[PDB]
Design a protein around this ligand. Structure first.
Ligand code: A1INU
Length: 128
């Protein structure tokens, strides 16, 4: 599946080069700019536990998910991953627990030491 493909092909976009956050670009975006810390960011996403016991999709709300980048309002993997993305880009992220919910997890929704996958489409980003 797409998770395995990210294991196999994904670029390690972590600073420590610990394979914590792996990325494949599925559709290239537009322009040169990627978002800065503080930018308001609009996305569509689908997320799941790597083994598929919980699935979550902004498409089910029929509206974008919006967050301020780099403020830790989302898991670290997103702050790192969305920061690499161009407007219009769709990317797959595979995320080790250290960059998601860790040893503690987020029970009952997310177990301890969970690996997460997401598909993310960066719709837009605008200055603070
Ligand atoms: C740990 O709790 C959650 C995790 C996740 C989604 C959660 C959630 O309950 C707060 O709610 C789903 C709800 C319908 C819409 N939504 C998203 C968020 N807040 N409300 C953002 C919450 C923080 O989530 C994240 O940082 C990441 C990246 C942004 C998108 C949501 N994220 C998730 O971790 C998801 C989980 C993905 C794997 C499958 C289970 C949900």
């Amino acid at each position: 599946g797409a998770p395995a493909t990210v294991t196999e092909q994904g670029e390690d976009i972590t600073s420590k080069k610990d394979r914590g956050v792996l990325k494949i670009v599925k559709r290239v975006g537009n322009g040169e700019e990627t978002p800065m810390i503080g930018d308001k960011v609009y996305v569509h996403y689908k997320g799941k536990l790597s083994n598929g016991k919980k699935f979550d999709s902004s498409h089910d709300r029929n509206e974008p998910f919006v967050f301020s980048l780099g403020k830790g309002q989302v898991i670290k993997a997103w702050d790192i991953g969305v920061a690499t993305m161009k407007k219009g880009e769709i990317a797959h992220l595979l995320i080790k627990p250290e960059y998601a919910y860790g040893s503690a997890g987020s029970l009952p929704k997310i177990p301890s030491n969970a690996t997460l996958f997401f598909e993310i489409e960066l719709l837009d980003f605008k200055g603070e």
